[PDB]
């Protein structure tokens with residue numbers, strides 16, 4: 001249906017736009033300071049995607065507020081910063097990774113659930129992040145759906161709601177099965 | 189009666205390989221005379237040289253204000269400069285069909301300075317504005333001289349009286365001026381120590397997650413005397429760069445030896461070819477072949493290049509037809525006289541409701557000379573670079589009346605103004621970068637230009 005893609009001033013957001021449009025979605029992109037929660041209510045999106053972006057969830061404009069308000073009401077996907085924001089919105093903590101991964105691919109292992117349904121395991125994904133969700137801090141309401149080779153959280157899923165984060169970029173040219181990963185979110 | 193969809197009238201002139209430099213010589217002193225030159229490069233995108241002069245309309249942007257000038261009429265506007273440009277193009281009532289042999293059929297040609305990006309994103313004002321040269325300086329031309337190295341044809345096209353334009357051209361006489369001389373040594377706007385401090389601040393932002401790559405540049409300044417066109421003739425021969433240009437502006441001269449295409453729009457087919465990755469050419473040919481292989485397989489450079497590929501997919505993806513964005517080429521090495529460059533190619537399709545000018549607005553300035561994420565990287569560049577970039581790392585090119593566009597990134601580009609000449613050099617800073625190697629790479633990219641002008 002109609003997807004609202006919240007843009008955290010990012011230079012990867014329109015790759016998500018292109019993938020969702022290719023899959024047949026109607027997509028609106030709005031910057032994280034161009035929208036209020038009242039405007040979202042007027043747009044009546046079917047699903048929301050929180051984009052990647054610089055800095056931390058605290059610098060992600062309306063992103064944390066949207067996650068808290070629409071959690072369990074419309075499906076939400078968080079990508080990279082969006083994934084971090086989703087963890088933070090329910091009490092998680094975002095910390096520096098052991099090693100920054102900027103334009104580097106990694107094999108990740110998942111449980112074949114949520115956006116990983118039907119995907120190969122392991123899966124090679126592009127990373128563009130300096131920060132991760134601290135595993136110790138992760139709220140009880142989330143399962144870890146995917147791990148890096150060094151046991152960093154690469155994905156989370158809310159145990160009740162359609163609320164899912166991935167730390168990597170399915171929309172990167174060197175990510176495996178990125179269209180199908182997003183198709184899982186679009187068509188569930 | 190008025191609207192013209194008719195193909196322009198064409199006179200074929202005598203074929204000579206040097207036709208563009210030959211004809212441009214007699215125009216090079218005129219404000220709004222402009223040359224796009226393929227550098228005589230052995231290169232897949234070295235086909236055309238384009239010459240224009242005597243515009244019917246000019247657009248000059250300094251900050252918020254664009255001045256549109258026609259023979260006896262001058263208008264000032266704070267509107268989006270690319271919307272103003274599109275309106276001016278539309279109002280010419282010249283609408284020819286695409287021609288594979290005439291990629292520019294008249295239209296807009298000139299400079300989009302890096303600081304024009306301040307019209308499309310809110311950016312801080314820390315770096316000093318010490319060069320007074322327009323953020324946009326574009327002429328509107330109803331004729332062009334096209335040199336085609338593939339067909340070996342020189343075509344003079346005009347939407348008016350092509351025989352009158354040919355007579356005008358053969359009536360201009362080349363009266364050569366004093367040769368170019370540098371009258372000071374080159375000096376940088378930063379010491380090795382200042383470069384280090386800036387480099388280390390970029391590394392802090394990389395580790396904090398503010399950014400993934402930042403293009404950090406220093407600027408070389410000298411005084412000069414004599415004719416900028418004579419300097420360009422020397423530099424063009426030495427650089428063999430396929431996106432070279434000479435612009436004579438009201439305020440000074442831009443001498444571009446860019447090897448880099450920004451955005452092509454060719455019958456609605458979009459191409460961008462970001463350069464990200466460099467190694468110096470080595471004198472021993474066996475060593476130099478090894479050097480090209482080392483670049484192609486460098487883990488650090490392939491990471492930086494991949495990032496800018498994903499970024500250029502995004503920038504083009506703001507307007508591209510859904511499903512049209514492709515990467516036909518990843519990590520190809522192109523050799524230039526000074527350096528090997530790692531180049532990738534992204535393609536897409538422009539929707540019929542949009543214009544090349546809308547694609548330019550969506551993408552400007554190039555991801556390849558800013559970083560990722562782009563807005564954060566431009567904030568950091570403004571924080572650390574002592575002066576605004578002005579013409580450097582903007583774009584030169586054309587928006588044809590047919591809808592076509594081609595643009596460069598103005599790397600390897602000199603600004604010559606008020607007897608001062610400026611030449612900047614940058615590189616991508618990423619987490620694996622080394623401070624001394626990145627300092628030295630800036631010299632590797634322009635040393636041959638600095639040294640050619642010094643004697």
Ligand SMILES: N[C@@H](Cc1c[nH]c2ccccc12)C(=O)O
Pocket residue numbers: 224225226233234235236237291430431432433584585586594595596
């Ligand atoms: N190389 C381009 C023409 C060109 C030369 N210099 C340029 C500068 C900007 C844009 C285009 C150009 C071609 O063959 O078509």
Ligand SMILES: [Cl-]
Pocket residue numbers: 029030031034
């Ligand atoms: Cl917006």
Ligand SMILES: [Cl-]
Pocket residue numbers: 094095096
């Ligand atoms: Cl930390």
Ligand SMILES: [Cl-]
Pocket residue numbers: 098099100619
């Ligand atoms: Cl690291």
Ligand SMILES: [Cl-]
Pocket residue numbers: 251252306
């Ligand atoms: Cl300004």
Ligand SMILES: [Cl-]
Pocket residue numbers: 385388
């Ligand atoms: Cl310090």
Ligand SMILES: [Cl-]
Pocket residue numbers: 463464465466615616
């Ligand atoms: Cl580079």
Ligand SMILES: [Cl-]
Pocket residue numbers: none
């Ligand atoms: Cl390979």
Ligand SMILES: [Cl-]
Pocket residue numbers: 599600612613614615633
């Ligand atoms: Cl450079």
Ligand SMILES: [Mg+2]
Pocket residue numbers: 464465466615616629
């Ligand atoms: Mg490099």
